[PDB]
Amino acid sequence: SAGYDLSVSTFSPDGRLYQVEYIYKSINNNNTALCLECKDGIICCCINSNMDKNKMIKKNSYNRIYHVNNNIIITYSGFDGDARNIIDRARSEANTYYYNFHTNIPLHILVNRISLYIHAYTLYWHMRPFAASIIISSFNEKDKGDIYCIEPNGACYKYSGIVIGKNKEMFKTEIEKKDYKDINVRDAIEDIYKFILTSDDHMNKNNLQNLVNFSWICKESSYEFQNIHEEILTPALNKAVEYIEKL
Amino acid sequence: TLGPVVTGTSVIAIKYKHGIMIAADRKASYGSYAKFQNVERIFKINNKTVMGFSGELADAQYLHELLTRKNINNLSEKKRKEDMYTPQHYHSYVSRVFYVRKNRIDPLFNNIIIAGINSQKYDNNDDNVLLYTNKNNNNEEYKEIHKDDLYIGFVDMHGTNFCDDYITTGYARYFALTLLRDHYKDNMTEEEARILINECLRILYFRDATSSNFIQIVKVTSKGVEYEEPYILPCVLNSADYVYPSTLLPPAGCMW
């Protein structure tokens, strides 16, 4: 602070940009999103636990998982409007790439372009920086999984599994126990439900159905985007719930 | 574009009892030169919509790009199968593009056919769309689709647009259309529709210099958009007088 935290274009005397750190705090307070690489696909999950008191919301109507070309998963934690802005930009870059080259934009190039777009809103004294971190991921047989997470400061890193948003540390502690590169996405579903039950103290076995978005790109879906059907999420939810209530 | 340079000739699209059957020979000519003989001229827009073109190939490829990305963005926002754009929607979009370009005196040198299935009640293909995989190439039967649920639209260079039970472009507007107005009927089977389309294409082969007999057939049905295996159409002359030698005719006079 000390007057150096009122603008995203002023460095503090210790070399820090405080508006960016305040955005980070906002994101860490927001809902949880995670993406996990498995043996035959990637699995993404958003836990909308901030909406637990919103009883009148239409069941399963709030979804934070989108896709780019029907084969890239993009999700976020942070402001919905800013995330929609960034997703629109991602799709616009994909359209432009196809128009120019007649092939789909590679994942890593798209990540670089999105991160540059985000970074450009941290440079001027009259623009609000985006308050959202983005997960962008794909999967195909030959390359296996690619998961990138873009920060509000504009830094993109590559992960085997990522958790952003609230309670991310506990989720990471649970995620890191098992090597999911040798587990199948279907089997990972139950693990994820168990992790949700433990880590998010606002989530119980009653609102697990209406507060969690599940999507994947896997062999079963021909390596194209798909929301996991309730006929697959139901047995996994029941099993996680009974196992947890046992202990 | 200032005028046609590389052109495709003619497309035929008709409704039959299981959906749309659209045909075009796989030929693109450089003037009177048949430079390309294996050209695709019918494109898939989505699982229920196809685009055929005659005229300039570059303009047709431009339009195909536009529609490909339009369908992609449609799928990006989809939350239920009803949200997918209908053939009527794409026909309106193409008619609008053409109208705007006419007003600038900058038209695409094409005639376009937009055809497909205008309903979502006959199957659940748009529940999980695959852009880069095809599962048809399971052992289910076609659904009879009511004619009113099928759509065949036409757009020309000036933006003229309309719909009908059968649409033709190019020389099919004379040769094929005559036989269709004479002989088309509702609820034809795939066999009858194919026979009629083949008769039209045979006449075109015999009377249109730009045409070929290597025919691509595409079907839009409850199973989605299906590309049939291209096939050579057998075209034999319908009179022995053509084959009679000239030397057997009288040598005197204008005998030729």
Short mmCIF file of C-alpha atoms in Angstrom, two decimals:
data_model
loop_
_atom_site.label_atom_id
_atom_site.label_comp_id
_atom_site.label_asym_id
_atom_site.label_seq_id
_atom_site.Cartn_x
_atom_site.Cartn_y
_atom_site.Cartn_z
CA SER A 1 0.00 0.00 0.00
CA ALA A 2 1.35 3.42 1.08
CA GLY A 3 -0.46 4.95 -1.90
CA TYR A 4 1.25 2.63 -4.39
CA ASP A 5 -1.72 0.23 -4.70
CA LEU A 6 -4.27 2.52 -6.39
CA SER A 7 -3.17 1.78 -9.97
CA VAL A 8 -2.13 -1.32 -11.89
CA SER A 9 0.50 0.79 -13.69
CA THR A 10 2.51 1.89 -10.62
CA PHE A 11 5.22 -0.34 -9.19
CA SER A 12 5.60 -0.24 -5.45
CA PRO A 13 9.02 0.71 -4.03
CA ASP A 14 9.65 -2.97 -3.26
CA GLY A 15 8.89 -3.89 -6.88
CA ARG A 16 5.37 -5.29 -6.46
CA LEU A 17 2.13 -4.53 -8.32
CA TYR A 18 -0.55 -4.49 -5.62
CA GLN A 19 -3.65 -4.37 -7.82
CA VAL A 20 -2.57 -7.72 -9.27
CA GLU A 21 -2.20 -9.20 -5.77
CA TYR A 22 -5.64 -7.89 -4.81
CA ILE A 23 -7.06 -9.60 -7.90
CA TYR A 24 -5.32 -12.79 -6.80
CA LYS A 25 -7.05 -12.49 -3.43
CA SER A 26 -10.41 -12.02 -5.18
CA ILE A 27 -9.83 -15.15 -7.29
CA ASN A 28 -8.74 -17.23 -4.29
CA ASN A 29 -11.98 -16.22 -2.56
CA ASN A 30 -14.10 -17.37 -5.53
CA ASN A 31 -15.51 -20.79 -6.40
CA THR A 32 -13.31 -23.80 -7.08
CA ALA A 33 -12.33 -25.18 -10.49
CA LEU A 34 -9.98 -28.07 -11.22
CA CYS A 35 -8.72 -30.03 -14.22
CA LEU A 36 -7.09 -33.45 -13.95
CA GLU A 37 -5.19 -35.53 -16.49
CA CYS A 38 -6.12 -39.22 -16.49
CA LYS A 39 -4.99 -42.23 -18.51
CA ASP A 40 -7.59 -41.89 -21.28
CA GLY A 41 -8.70 -38.28 -20.93
CA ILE A 42 -8.85 -35.10 -18.90
CA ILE A 43 -11.60 -34.33 -16.40
CA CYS A 44 -12.71 -30.86 -15.32
CA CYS A 45 -14.87 -30.00 -12.33
CA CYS A 46 -16.31 -26.74 -11.02
CA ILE A 47 -17.69 -26.58 -7.48
CA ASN A 48 -20.17 -23.71 -7.17
CA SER A 49 -20.28 -23.74 -3.38
CA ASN A 50 -20.76 -19.96 -3.16
CA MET A 51 -24.31 -20.52 -4.46
CA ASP A 52 -25.38 -22.91 -1.70
CA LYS A 53 -27.84 -20.40 -0.21
CA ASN A 54 -29.35 -19.61 -3.65
CA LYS A 55 -32.15 -22.16 -3.39
CA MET A 56 -34.26 -20.75 -6.23
CA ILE A 57 -31.58 -20.97 -8.93
CA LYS A 58 -32.69 -23.34 -11.67
CA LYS A 59 -31.13 -26.73 -11.02
CA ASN A 60 -27.77 -27.18 -12.77
CA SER A 61 -28.14 -23.92 -14.72
CA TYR A 62 -24.87 -22.24 -13.68
CA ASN A 63 -21.97 -23.85 -15.53
CA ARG A 64 -18.41 -22.49 -15.60
CA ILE A 65 -17.04 -24.98 -18.16
CA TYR A 66 -16.96 -23.93 -21.82
CA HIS A 67 -15.13 -25.19 -24.89
CA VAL A 68 -13.41 -23.62 -27.89
CA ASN A 69 -13.47 -25.90 -30.94
CA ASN A 70 -15.40 -28.80 -29.39
CA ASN A 71 -12.02 -30.22 -28.31
CA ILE A 72 -10.57 -27.67 -25.82
CA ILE A 73 -11.95 -27.21 -22.30
CA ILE A 74 -11.81 -23.70 -20.86
CA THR A 75 -13.00 -22.85 -17.36
CA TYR A 76 -12.28 -20.20 -14.76
CA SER A 77 -12.52 -18.95 -11.21
CA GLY A 78 -13.33 -15.27 -10.76
CA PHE A 79 -15.72 -12.71 -12.20
CA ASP A 80 -18.18 -14.27 -14.63
CA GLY A 81 -18.23 -11.27 -16.95
CA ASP A 82 -14.45 -11.03 -17.28
CA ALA A 83 -14.24 -14.78 -17.88
CA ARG A 84 -16.89 -14.55 -20.59
CA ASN A 85 -14.88 -11.73 -22.15
CA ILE A 86 -11.74 -13.87 -22.19
CA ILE A 87 -13.63 -16.88 -23.54
CA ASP A 88 -15.07 -14.75 -26.33
CA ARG A 89 -11.53 -13.65 -27.15
CA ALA A 90 -10.34 -17.28 -27.13
CA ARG A 91 -13.07 -18.27 -29.57
CA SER A 92 -12.31 -15.22 -31.73
CA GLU A 93 -8.65 -16.23 -31.90
CA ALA A 94 -9.68 -19.78 -32.84
CA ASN A 95 -11.92 -18.44 -35.63
CA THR A 96 -9.15 -16.20 -36.93
CA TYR A 97 -6.64 -19.05 -36.86
CA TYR A 98 -8.98 -21.30 -38.84
CA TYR A 99 -9.69 -18.50 -41.32
CA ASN A 100 -5.99 -17.88 -41.89
CA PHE A 101 -4.74 -21.47 -41.90
CA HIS A 102 -7.69 -23.90 -42.24
CA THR A 103 -6.50 -25.91 -39.23
CA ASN A 104 -7.51 -25.57 -35.61
CA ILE A 105 -5.40 -23.34 -33.40
CA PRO A 106 -2.89 -25.42 -31.40
CA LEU A 107 -3.49 -25.36 -27.67
CA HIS A 108 -0.18 -23.75 -26.70
CA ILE A 109 -0.45 -20.94 -29.27
CA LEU A 110 -4.00 -20.22 -28.09
CA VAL A 111 -2.77 -20.13 -24.49
CA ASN A 112 -0.04 -17.64 -25.41
CA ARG A 113 -2.55 -15.41 -27.20
CA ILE A 114 -5.02 -15.48 -24.29
CA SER A 115 -2.29 -14.72 -21.77
CA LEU A 116 -1.09 -11.77 -23.85
CA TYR A 117 -4.67 -10.46 -24.09
CA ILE A 118 -5.00 -10.67 -20.29
CA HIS A 119 -1.56 -9.13 -19.71
CA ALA A 120 -2.47 -6.15 -21.90
CA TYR A 121 -5.09 -5.10 -19.32
CA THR A 122 -2.41 -4.73 -16.62
CA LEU A 123 -0.42 -2.08 -18.52
CA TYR A 124 -2.51 1.13 -18.54
CA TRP A 125 -3.76 3.50 -15.83
CA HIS A 126 -7.35 3.61 -17.16
CA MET A 127 -8.26 -0.10 -17.62
CA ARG A 128 -9.37 -2.52 -14.93
CA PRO A 129 -7.33 -5.76 -15.01
CA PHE A 130 -9.30 -8.98 -15.42
CA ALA A 131 -10.24 -10.66 -12.13
CA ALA A 132 -10.11 -14.28 -13.22
CA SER A 133 -7.70 -17.16 -13.68
CA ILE A 134 -8.31 -19.48 -16.61
CA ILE A 135 -7.81 -23.21 -17.12
CA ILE A 136 -7.39 -24.29 -20.74
CA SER A 137 -6.89 -27.95 -21.54
CA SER A 138 -7.21 -30.58 -24.24
CA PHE A 139 -6.47 -34.26 -24.77
CA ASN A 140 -5.87 -36.56 -27.71
CA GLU A 141 -4.59 -40.10 -28.11
CA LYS A 142 -1.09 -39.29 -29.35
CA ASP A 143 -0.35 -36.32 -27.08
CA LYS A 144 -2.26 -37.38 -23.95
CA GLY A 145 -3.34 -34.41 -21.82
CA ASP A 146 -2.30 -30.77 -21.95
CA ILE A 147 -3.44 -28.50 -19.09
CA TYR A 148 -2.54 -24.80 -18.88
CA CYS A 149 -3.55 -22.28 -16.21
CA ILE A 150 -3.35 -18.55 -16.98
CA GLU A 151 -2.97 -16.07 -14.14
CA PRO A 152 -4.40 -12.54 -14.01
CA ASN A 153 -0.83 -11.23 -14.27
CA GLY A 154 -0.73 -13.04 -17.62
CA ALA A 155 1.60 -15.92 -16.75
CA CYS A 156 0.68 -19.30 -18.23
CA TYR A 157 2.09 -22.54 -16.84
CA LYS A 158 1.55 -26.19 -17.75
CA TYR A 159 0.30 -28.74 -15.22
CA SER A 160 -0.68 -32.38 -14.93
CA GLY A 161 -3.46 -31.31 -12.56
CA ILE A 162 -4.55 -27.86 -11.40
CA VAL A 163 -6.86 -26.38 -8.77
CA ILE A 164 -7.79 -22.70 -8.68
CA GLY A 165 -10.16 -20.77 -6.46
CA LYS A 166 -11.26 -21.43 -2.91
CA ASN A 167 -9.83 -24.29 -0.83
CA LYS A 168 -7.39 -25.07 -3.64
CA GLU A 169 -4.65 -26.12 -1.21
CA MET A 170 -6.67 -28.94 0.36
CA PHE A 171 -7.83 -30.06 -3.08
CA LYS A 172 -4.21 -30.18 -4.26
CA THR A 173 -3.22 -32.16 -1.16
CA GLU A 174 -5.91 -34.72 -2.00
CA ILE A 175 -5.10 -34.71 -5.73
CA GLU A 176 -1.37 -35.28 -5.30
CA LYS A 177 -1.73 -38.58 -3.41
CA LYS A 178 -2.46 -40.69 -6.50
CA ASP A 179 -0.84 -40.72 -9.95
CA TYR A 180 -3.92 -40.23 -12.13
CA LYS A 181 -2.00 -40.75 -15.37
CA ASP A 182 -2.65 -44.46 -14.70
CA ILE A 183 -6.30 -44.06 -13.59
CA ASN A 184 -9.27 -43.77 -15.95
CA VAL A 185 -11.50 -40.69 -15.98
CA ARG A 186 -14.53 -42.70 -14.86
CA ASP A 187 -12.60 -43.95 -11.84
CA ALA A 188 -11.37 -40.40 -11.17
CA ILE A 189 -14.99 -39.21 -10.89
CA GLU A 190 -15.52 -40.88 -7.51
CA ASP A 191 -12.19 -39.59 -6.22
CA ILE A 192 -13.21 -36.06 -7.20
CA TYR A 193 -16.56 -36.37 -5.43
CA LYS A 194 -14.77 -37.57 -2.29
CA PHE A 195 -12.36 -34.64 -2.49
CA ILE A 196 -15.28 -32.23 -2.81
CA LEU A 197 -17.02 -33.75 0.20
CA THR A 198 -13.89 -33.37 2.31
CA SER A 199 -12.31 -30.10 1.19
CA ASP A 200 -15.34 -27.83 0.68
CA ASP A 201 -17.08 -27.66 4.05
CA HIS A 202 -20.01 -25.87 2.39
CA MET A 203 -20.74 -28.95 0.23
CA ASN A 204 -22.69 -31.95 1.53
CA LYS A 205 -24.27 -35.01 -0.07
CA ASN A 206 -27.51 -33.04 -0.57
CA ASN A 207 -26.22 -30.27 -2.88
CA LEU A 208 -23.49 -32.29 -4.60
CA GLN A 209 -25.86 -32.91 -7.51
CA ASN A 210 -26.88 -29.32 -8.28
CA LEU A 211 -23.66 -27.49 -7.32
CA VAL A 212 -21.01 -29.34 -9.37
CA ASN A 213 -20.29 -29.09 -13.10
CA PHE A 214 -18.50 -32.06 -14.69
CA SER A 215 -17.07 -32.23 -18.20
CA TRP A 216 -14.37 -34.24 -19.92
CA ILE A 217 -12.52 -34.91 -23.13
CA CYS A 218 -11.75 -38.62 -23.28
CA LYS A 219 -11.74 -41.74 -25.42
CA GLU A 220 -15.38 -42.42 -24.54
CA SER A 221 -16.41 -39.04 -26.02
CA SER A 222 -14.15 -39.46 -29.09
CA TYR A 223 -11.77 -36.84 -27.66
CA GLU A 224 -14.35 -34.08 -28.05
CA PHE A 225 -16.00 -31.92 -25.41
CA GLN A 226 -18.88 -33.45 -23.46
CA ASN A 227 -20.63 -32.83 -20.16
CA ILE A 228 -20.58 -36.01 -18.11
CA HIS A 229 -24.04 -37.54 -18.16
CA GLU A 230 -25.93 -37.80 -14.89
CA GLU A 231 -26.18 -41.56 -15.50
CA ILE A 232 -22.40 -41.67 -14.93
CA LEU A 233 -22.17 -39.07 -12.15
CA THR A 234 -24.94 -40.65 -10.05
CA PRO A 235 -23.32 -43.99 -9.07
CA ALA A 236 -20.02 -42.21 -8.43
CA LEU A 237 -21.73 -39.63 -6.21
CA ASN A 238 -23.55 -42.33 -4.25
CA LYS A 239 -20.36 -44.35 -3.77
CA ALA A 240 -18.32 -41.36 -2.61
CA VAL A 241 -21.10 -40.34 -0.23
CA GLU A 242 -21.51 -43.77 1.36
CA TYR A 243 -17.75 -44.24 1.65
CA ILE A 244 -17.41 -40.87 3.39
CA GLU A 245 -20.34 -41.46 5.76
CA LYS A 246 -18.66 -44.76 6.69
CA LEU A 247 -15.72 -42.83 8.18
CA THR B 1 -14.00 -11.47 -57.70
CA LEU B 2 -14.72 -9.88 -61.09
CA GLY B 3 -16.02 -12.99 -62.84
CA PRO B 4 -15.94 -16.79 -62.84
CA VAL B 5 -12.61 -18.48 -63.55
CA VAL B 6 -12.90 -21.98 -62.03
CA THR B 7 -16.52 -23.15 -62.00
CA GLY B 8 -18.75 -26.04 -61.01
CA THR B 9 -21.80 -26.65 -63.14
CA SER B 10 -25.02 -27.85 -61.53
CA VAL B 11 -26.55 -29.24 -58.33
CA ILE B 12 -29.84 -31.10 -57.77
CA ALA B 13 -31.56 -31.40 -54.39
CA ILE B 14 -34.90 -33.11 -53.72
CA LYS B 15 -36.94 -34.16 -50.71
CA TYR B 16 -37.74 -37.83 -50.37
CA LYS B 17 -39.36 -39.90 -47.62
CA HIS B 18 -36.23 -40.03 -45.43
CA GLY B 19 -34.87 -36.52 -45.93
CA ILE B 20 -32.78 -34.67 -48.52
CA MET B 21 -30.93 -36.15 -51.49
CA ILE B 22 -28.51 -33.70 -53.11
CA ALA B 23 -26.24 -34.45 -56.06
CA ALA B 24 -23.43 -32.77 -57.96
CA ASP B 25 -20.77 -34.03 -60.33
CA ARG B 26 -17.23 -33.73 -58.97
CA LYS B 27 -15.95 -31.36 -61.64
CA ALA B 28 -14.48 -27.86 -61.72
CA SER B 29 -13.53 -26.41 -65.09
CA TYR B 30 -11.03 -23.74 -66.12
CA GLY B 31 -13.10 -22.37 -68.95
CA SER B 32 -13.56 -25.19 -71.45
CA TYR B 33 -10.64 -27.03 -69.80
CA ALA B 34 -11.66 -29.78 -67.34
CA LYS B 35 -8.74 -29.17 -65.02
CA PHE B 36 -10.16 -30.61 -61.79
CA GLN B 37 -12.18 -33.82 -62.00
CA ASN B 38 -12.40 -34.84 -58.33
CA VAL B 39 -13.74 -31.70 -56.65
CA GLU B 40 -16.15 -31.77 -53.74
CA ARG B 41 -19.04 -29.37 -54.30
CA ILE B 42 -21.46 -30.39 -51.52
CA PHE B 43 -20.34 -29.43 -48.01
CA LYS B 44 -21.68 -30.37 -44.59
CA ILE B 45 -22.66 -27.38 -42.45
CA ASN B 46 -23.99 -29.34 -39.49
CA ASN B 47 -25.58 -32.74 -38.89
CA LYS B 48 -28.83 -31.50 -40.45
CA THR B 49 -27.67 -28.98 -43.08
CA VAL B 50 -25.66 -29.18 -46.31
CA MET B 51 -24.48 -26.58 -48.81
CA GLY B 52 -24.20 -27.10 -52.55
CA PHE B 53 -22.92 -24.55 -55.03
CA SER B 54 -22.50 -23.87 -58.71
CA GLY B 55 -20.33 -21.17 -60.21
CA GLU B 56 -16.97 -19.87 -59.00
CA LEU B 57 -15.02 -22.23 -56.76
CA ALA B 58 -13.09 -19.57 -54.81
CA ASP B 59 -16.29 -17.76 -53.79
CA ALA B 60 -17.84 -21.08 -52.80
CA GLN B 61 -14.83 -21.91 -50.63
CA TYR B 62 -15.11 -18.48 -48.98
CA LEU B 63 -18.78 -19.09 -48.17
CA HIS B 64 -18.00 -22.59 -46.92
CA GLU B 65 -15.43 -21.11 -44.53
CA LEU B 66 -17.96 -18.57 -43.25
CA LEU B 67 -20.54 -21.27 -42.56
CA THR B 68 -18.01 -23.65 -41.00
CA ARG B 69 -17.07 -21.06 -38.40
CA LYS B 70 -20.71 -20.04 -37.91
CA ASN B 71 -21.58 -23.65 -37.06
CA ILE B 72 -18.55 -23.86 -34.77
CA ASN B 73 -19.66 -20.81 -32.79
CA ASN B 74 -23.21 -22.19 -32.73
CA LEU B 75 -21.86 -25.35 -31.10
CA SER B 76 -19.77 -23.23 -28.71
CA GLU B 77 -22.93 -21.64 -27.25
CA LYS B 78 -25.18 -24.71 -27.44
CA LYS B 79 -26.80 -25.89 -24.21
CA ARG B 80 -29.46 -28.16 -25.75
CA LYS B 81 -30.06 -29.71 -29.15
CA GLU B 82 -32.79 -27.18 -29.98
CA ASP B 83 -30.20 -24.38 -30.03
CA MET B 84 -28.48 -25.63 -33.21
CA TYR B 85 -29.17 -23.46 -36.25
CA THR B 86 -31.67 -24.84 -38.75
CA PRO B 87 -31.23 -24.99 -42.53
CA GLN B 88 -33.70 -22.10 -42.67
CA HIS B 89 -31.36 -20.06 -40.46
CA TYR B 90 -28.39 -20.73 -42.74
CA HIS B 91 -30.45 -19.97 -45.85
CA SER B 92 -31.42 -16.62 -44.34
CA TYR B 93 -27.79 -15.94 -43.44
CA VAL B 94 -26.56 -16.73 -46.97
CA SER B 95 -29.34 -14.70 -48.60
CA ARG B 96 -28.31 -11.78 -46.39
CA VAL B 97 -24.61 -12.09 -47.27
CA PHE B 98 -25.56 -12.08 -50.95
CA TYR B 99 -27.89 -9.10 -50.59
CA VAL B 100 -25.22 -7.06 -48.80
CA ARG B 101 -22.65 -7.89 -51.46
CA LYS B 102 -25.08 -6.99 -54.24
CA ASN B 103 -25.60 -3.57 -52.69
CA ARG B 104 -21.82 -3.04 -52.89
CA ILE B 105 -21.65 -4.44 -56.45
CA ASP B 106 -19.27 -7.09 -55.09
CA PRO B 107 -21.20 -10.37 -55.38
CA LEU B 108 -20.06 -13.92 -54.94
CA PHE B 109 -20.35 -15.50 -58.40
CA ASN B 110 -22.36 -18.46 -57.14
CA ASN B 111 -25.79 -19.98 -57.00
CA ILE B 112 -26.22 -21.73 -53.65
CA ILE B 113 -28.46 -24.51 -52.35
CA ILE B 114 -28.99 -24.84 -48.60
CA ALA B 115 -30.82 -28.04 -47.68
CA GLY B 116 -31.38 -30.09 -44.57
CA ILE B 117 -33.79 -31.16 -41.86
CA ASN B 118 -35.71 -28.32 -40.19
CA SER B 119 -36.61 -30.24 -37.01
CA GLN B 120 -34.92 -31.87 -34.02
CA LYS B 121 -37.61 -34.44 -33.16
CA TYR B 122 -36.41 -37.26 -35.45
CA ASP B 123 -33.11 -38.13 -33.71
CA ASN B 124 -30.65 -37.10 -30.99
CA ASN B 125 -27.59 -36.47 -33.14
CA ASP B 126 -27.23 -32.89 -31.89
CA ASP B 127 -27.09 -34.08 -28.28
CA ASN B 128 -23.33 -34.83 -28.61
CA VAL B 129 -21.94 -33.34 -31.82
CA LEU B 130 -18.69 -34.77 -33.18
CA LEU B 131 -16.91 -32.39 -35.53
CA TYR B 132 -13.91 -34.60 -36.29
CA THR B 133 -15.32 -38.13 -35.93
CA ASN B 134 -18.08 -39.88 -37.86
CA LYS B 135 -19.79 -42.90 -36.28
CA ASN B 136 -21.92 -43.88 -39.30
CA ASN B 137 -18.73 -45.10 -41.01
CA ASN B 138 -25.82 -48.31 -35.26
CA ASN B 139 -27.79 -50.84 -37.33
CA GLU B 140 -30.85 -48.60 -37.15
CA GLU B 141 -33.47 -47.76 -39.75
CA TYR B 142 -34.21 -44.37 -41.26
CA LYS B 143 -37.08 -42.32 -39.87
CA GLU B 144 -39.70 -41.07 -42.30
CA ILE B 145 -39.50 -37.27 -42.09
CA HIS B 146 -42.56 -35.24 -42.95
CA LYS B 147 -41.96 -33.08 -46.01
CA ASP B 148 -42.82 -29.94 -44.03
CA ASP B 149 -39.89 -30.71 -41.70
CA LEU B 150 -37.45 -30.68 -44.65
CA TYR B 151 -35.91 -27.56 -46.16
CA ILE B 152 -34.32 -26.82 -49.54
CA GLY B 153 -33.41 -23.20 -50.17
CA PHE B 154 -31.92 -21.35 -53.15
CA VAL B 155 -29.83 -18.18 -53.33
CA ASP B 156 -28.56 -16.53 -56.51
CA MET B 157 -26.13 -13.68 -57.16
CA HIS B 158 -28.75 -10.93 -56.79
CA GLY B 159 -30.01 -12.34 -53.49
CA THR B 160 -33.13 -13.97 -54.93
CA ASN B 161 -34.12 -16.64 -52.43
CA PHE B 162 -36.95 -19.14 -52.11
CA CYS B 163 -37.64 -22.71 -51.00
CA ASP B 164 -39.33 -25.68 -52.67
CA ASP B 165 -39.55 -29.47 -52.64
CA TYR B 166 -36.77 -29.66 -55.25
CA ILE B 167 -34.16 -27.08 -56.21
CA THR B 168 -31.76 -27.00 -59.14
CA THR B 169 -28.85 -24.80 -60.18
CA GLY B 170 -27.22 -24.13 -63.51
CA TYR B 171 -28.22 -26.31 -66.44
CA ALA B 172 -30.29 -28.47 -64.10
CA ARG B 173 -32.66 -25.49 -64.03
CA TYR B 174 -33.62 -26.51 -67.58
CA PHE B 175 -32.94 -30.22 -68.03
CA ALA B 176 -33.40 -31.66 -64.53
CA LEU B 177 -36.13 -29.24 -63.49
CA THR B 178 -38.32 -30.17 -66.46
CA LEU B 179 -38.26 -33.84 -65.51
CA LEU B 180 -38.77 -32.97 -61.84
CA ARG B 181 -41.81 -30.77 -62.48
CA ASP B 182 -43.10 -33.60 -64.66
CA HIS B 183 -42.27 -36.56 -62.43
CA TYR B 184 -41.30 -35.70 -58.84
CA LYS B 185 -43.68 -36.90 -56.13
CA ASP B 186 -43.86 -36.81 -52.36
CA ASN B 187 -42.56 -39.59 -50.11
CA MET B 188 -40.33 -41.17 -52.76
CA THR B 189 -38.09 -43.97 -51.55
CA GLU B 190 -34.32 -43.72 -51.82
CA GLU B 191 -34.48 -45.97 -54.88
CA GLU B 192 -36.98 -43.80 -56.78
CA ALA B 193 -35.26 -40.55 -55.80
CA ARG B 194 -31.90 -41.96 -56.91
CA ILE B 195 -33.36 -43.19 -60.21
CA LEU B 196 -34.87 -39.77 -60.99
CA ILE B 197 -31.70 -37.90 -60.01
CA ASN B 198 -29.65 -40.26 -62.17
CA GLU B 199 -31.92 -39.67 -65.17
CA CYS B 200 -31.45 -35.92 -64.72
CA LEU B 201 -27.67 -36.29 -64.42
CA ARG B 202 -27.56 -38.47 -67.55
CA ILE B 203 -29.37 -35.80 -69.56
CA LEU B 204 -26.97 -33.21 -68.16
CA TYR B 205 -24.00 -35.38 -69.13
CA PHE B 206 -25.33 -35.63 -72.68
CA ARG B 207 -26.23 -31.93 -73.03
CA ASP B 208 -24.05 -29.81 -70.70
CA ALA B 209 -20.45 -29.36 -71.84
CA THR B 210 -19.25 -28.48 -68.33
CA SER B 211 -20.75 -31.60 -66.73
CA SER B 212 -19.19 -34.96 -65.93
CA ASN B 213 -20.54 -38.40 -65.09
CA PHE B 214 -18.62 -38.80 -61.81
CA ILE B 215 -21.45 -38.12 -59.38
CA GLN B 216 -21.31 -37.37 -55.66
CA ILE B 217 -24.57 -38.08 -53.82
CA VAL B 218 -25.19 -36.75 -50.32
CA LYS B 219 -28.10 -37.65 -48.05
CA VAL B 220 -29.44 -35.82 -45.00
CA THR B 221 -31.63 -38.16 -42.95
CA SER B 222 -32.30 -39.23 -39.37
CA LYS B 223 -28.78 -40.71 -39.36
CA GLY B 224 -27.23 -37.34 -40.26
CA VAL B 225 -25.31 -36.20 -43.31
CA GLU B 226 -24.04 -39.15 -45.36
CA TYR B 227 -21.62 -38.93 -48.27
CA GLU B 228 -22.20 -41.82 -50.65
CA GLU B 229 -19.31 -43.40 -52.50
CA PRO B 230 -18.70 -41.40 -55.70
CA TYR B 231 -19.70 -43.38 -58.76
CA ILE B 232 -19.40 -43.18 -62.53
CA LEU B 233 -22.80 -42.82 -64.18
CA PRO B 234 -23.22 -45.13 -67.21
CA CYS B 235 -24.39 -42.98 -70.14
CA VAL B 236 -25.15 -44.71 -73.45
CA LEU B 237 -26.51 -42.97 -76.53
CA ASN B 238 -30.26 -43.40 -77.02
CA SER B 239 -30.24 -43.94 -80.79
CA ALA B 240 -28.48 -46.11 -83.36
CA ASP B 241 -28.69 -43.26 -85.88
CA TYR B 242 -25.82 -41.54 -84.05
CA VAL B 243 -23.56 -44.56 -84.55
CA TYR B 244 -24.40 -45.15 -88.23
CA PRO B 245 -21.25 -44.58 -90.33
CA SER B 246 -21.20 -41.50 -92.53
CA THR B 247 -20.03 -43.53 -95.53
CA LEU B 248 -23.29 -45.52 -95.54
CA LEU B 249 -25.24 -42.29 -96.13
CA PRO B 250 -25.48 -40.72 -99.60
CA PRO B 251 -22.18 -39.09 -100.63
CA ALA B 252 -23.98 -36.13 -102.25
CA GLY B 253 -25.43 -33.05 -100.57
CA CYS B 254 -25.21 -31.82 -96.99
CA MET B 255 -25.18 -35.29 -95.45
CA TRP B 256 -23.63 -34.79 -92.03
#
